[PDB]
Scaffold this active site. Structure first.
Site, PDB file in Angstrom:
ATOM      1  N   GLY A  27      74.513  53.810  20.618  1.00  0.00           N
ATOM      2  CA  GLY A  27      73.884  53.426  19.346  1.00  0.00           C
ATOM      3  C   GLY A  27      72.973  52.587  20.410  1.00  0.00           C
ATOM      4  N   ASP A 161      78.986  41.788  11.915  1.00  0.00           N
ATOM      5  CA  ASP A 161      77.326  41.860  12.316  1.00  0.00           C
ATOM      6  C   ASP A 161      77.180  39.492  11.942  1.00  0.00           C
ATOM      7  OD1 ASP A 161      77.577  43.765  14.118  1.00  0.00           O
ATOM      8  OD2 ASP A 161      76.175  45.436  11.735  1.00  0.00           O
TER       9      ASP A 161
END
Ligand SMILES: C[C@@]1(C(=O)NCc2ccccc2)CN(C2COC2)CCN1
Ligand SMILES: [Cl-]
Ligand SMILES: [Cl-]
Ligand SMILES: [Cl-]
Ligand SMILES: [Cl-]
Ligand SMILES: [Cl-]
Ligand SMILES: [Cl-]
Ligand SMILES: [Mg+2]
Length: 343
Positions: A27, A161
């Site tokens: 990604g 995150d």
């Protein structure tokens, strides 16, 4: 110093220690990510190459912030740092930063399947256990949502995150705003760690029903969905909203009572309903905390107060410090070269 090797993967150059093998892109605005096999530990890992980490004062400080936070987090229910490296041999040639973590497969979206009440108990217990740890260091996550919660085959969960988001990202019919507490969505006041408990309530409701709790089409639609469930604010909360304009807007709305949560969450465990009523409170001063929620009867089969640890103290004084790009870069370099891997 390990031996490094170079290779080009999807038009970017990766220079990494020999221990990391079989790199495969996975990604990519803050950096690119590759999956790899770590021959030293036997783990499958994610290797993230930061993009332009020192291009501005704002970006250099953000790079330092992320590295400090990841180096501190040592808890079963929070993402930790397996390694950090640079191919530079000195501060003078230091330009690139690579971060290594355990490779995560599915997130709570890829499960939110058929969830029993026992599954909801275990998943929310683990989020709160991680949050008790995070909050004990005076860290606020600020971006809890299903895509930031990793889950494995055995329903074991990790928070990732951390909030380190722009105006466009929060506009319209977007999951990036559906889990945010109203006081931060609308900048009512200085917020604190209670914002994360609002997010947990939104997540728990979605696990119980299979549906987003507050899927607003914009900020105002979302506020109307929120106030229909929890009621319009009383004078006590209104006094705490510092924007005179936001206060004015709230008072333009017709008053509404809090709804009966047993008639919203039809058929749910009454102890789950009770906990939702204690998380989803408009006044953030009155929400249940993570430490209090772990002792709630809903988690009776998992709660163990001898196995719910707190964090070492965390010095965030750098956040109010004003430094030059090269000073932030030097602080980051020191943190790279002082890293000690976990056992
Ligand atoms: C909570 C809700 C839901 O998903 N209801 C379906 C359900 C499924 C399983 C068990 C209980 C309830 C209802 N809507 C309307 C708005 O006030 C009720 C708001 C968001 N989703
Ligand atoms: Cl190596
Ligand atoms: Cl981890
Ligand atoms: Cl470099
Ligand atoms: Cl999400
Ligand atoms: Cl009214
Ligand atoms: Cl510290
Ligand atoms: Mg994310």
């Amino acid at each position: 110093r390990p031996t490094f090797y170079r290779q080009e993967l999807n038009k970017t150059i990766w220079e990494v220690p020999e221990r990391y093998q079989n790199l495969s892109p996975v990604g990519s605005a803050y950096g690119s990510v590759c999956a790899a096999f770590d021959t030293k530990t036997g783990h499958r890992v994610a290797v993230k190459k930061l993009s332009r980490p020192f291009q501005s004062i704002i970006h250099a400080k953000r790079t330092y912030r992320e590295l400090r936070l990841l180096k501190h987090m040592k808890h079963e229910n929070v993402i930790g740092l397996l390694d950090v490296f640079t191919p530079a041999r000195s501060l003078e040639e230091f330009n690139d930063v690579y971060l290594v973590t355990h490779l995560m497969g599915a997130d709570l979206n890829n499960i939110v399947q058929k969830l029993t009440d026992d599954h909801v108990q275990f998943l929310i217990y683990q989020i709160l256990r991680g949050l008790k740890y995070i909050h004990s260091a005076d860290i606020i996550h600020r971006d809890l949502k299903p895509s930031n919660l990793a889950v494995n085959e055995d329903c074991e969960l990790k928070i990732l995150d951390f909030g380190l988001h722009t105006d466009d990202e929060m506009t319209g019919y977007v999951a990036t705003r559906w889990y945010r507490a109203p006081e931060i969505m609308l900048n009512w006041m200085h917020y604190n760690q209670t914002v994360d408990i609002w997010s947990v309530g939104c997540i728990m409701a979605e696990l119980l029903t299979g549906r987003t709790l507050f899927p607003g089409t914009d900020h105002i639609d979302q506020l109307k969905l929120i106030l229909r469930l929890v009621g319009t604010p009383g004078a006590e909360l209104l006094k705490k909203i510092s924007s005179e304009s936001a206060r004015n807007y709230i008072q333009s709305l017709a008053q509404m009572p809090k709804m009966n949560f047993a008639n919203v969450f039809i058929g749910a465990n009454p102890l789950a309903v009770d906990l939702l009523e204690k998380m989803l409170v408009l006044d953030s001063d009155k929400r249940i905390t993570a430490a209090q929620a772990l002792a709630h009867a809903y988690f009776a089969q998992y709660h163990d107060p001898d196995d719910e640890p707190v964090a070492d103290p965390y010095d965030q004084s750098f956040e109010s410090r004003d430094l030059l790009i090269d000073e932030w870069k030097s602080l980051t370099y020191d943190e790279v070269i002082s890293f000690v891997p976990p056992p």
